[PDB]
Each structure stands twice: as C-alpha cells, then as structure tokens.
Structure 1
Amino acid sequence: GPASFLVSLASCLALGSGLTACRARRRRLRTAA
C-alpha cells in the first residue's frame, strides 16, 4: 500500500515538474517570436 502510494506520488510530481520545465523554456526562449 504505502510503497505504491509513494510511487504514484513521485510519478505525479516528476510529471508535473517535467511539464512545467518544458512549458517554461518553450515560452521564455521564444518570447520575441
């Protein structure tokens, strides 16, 4: 139980961090364009 919950939490946090990082550089690095 707890191990699966921790795995799901870590996966969700990693996915959120990756999506935020991808969107951040997609937006700033192309502010002029």
Structure 2
Amino acid sequence: RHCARPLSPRDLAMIYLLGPASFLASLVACLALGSALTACRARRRRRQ
C-alpha cells in the first residue's frame, strides 16, 4: 500500500476527466488522419 497518498485536486480532475479527454483525443487524431488521407488521395487523383 505504498501508493496510498492524499488525493490532490489535480488527481480528482484527472480521475474525472481522463476518460473523456482520451476519447476526445482519439476522435481528434482519427479526424486528422482521415482528413490527411483524403487530401492525399484527392491530390494523387487530380494531378494525373
């Protein structure tokens, strides 16, 4: 039980928001990857 320690306000905020923050980050990353891939495909299609 060495990890036992008082719960700081930053600990509370991270505990209540890490799930939503991680899911929002995943959505943003997937959106960026999709936009980049679609732009690359459009560029390779139009230039020929």
Q: Could you state the TM-score of these two structures normalised by the residue count of structure 2?
A: 0.61
* Residue matched to 1:28: 46
Q: Deviations over 1:1-33 (max 9, x none)?
A: 000000000000000000000000100011xxx
Aligned with 2:36: secondary structure? Answer: helix
Letter of the 1:5 counterpart: F
Q: CA RMSD in A?
A: 0.3
- Percent identity over paired residues: 80
Distance in 1, matches of 2:33 and 2:41, equals: 12
1:9 matched to 2:27: yes
Question: What is the number of residues matched between the two proteins?
Answer: 30
Moved over 6 A (4+): none
Structure 2 unaligned segments of length 5 or more: list them: 1-18
Structure 1 unaligned segments of length 5 or more: list them: none
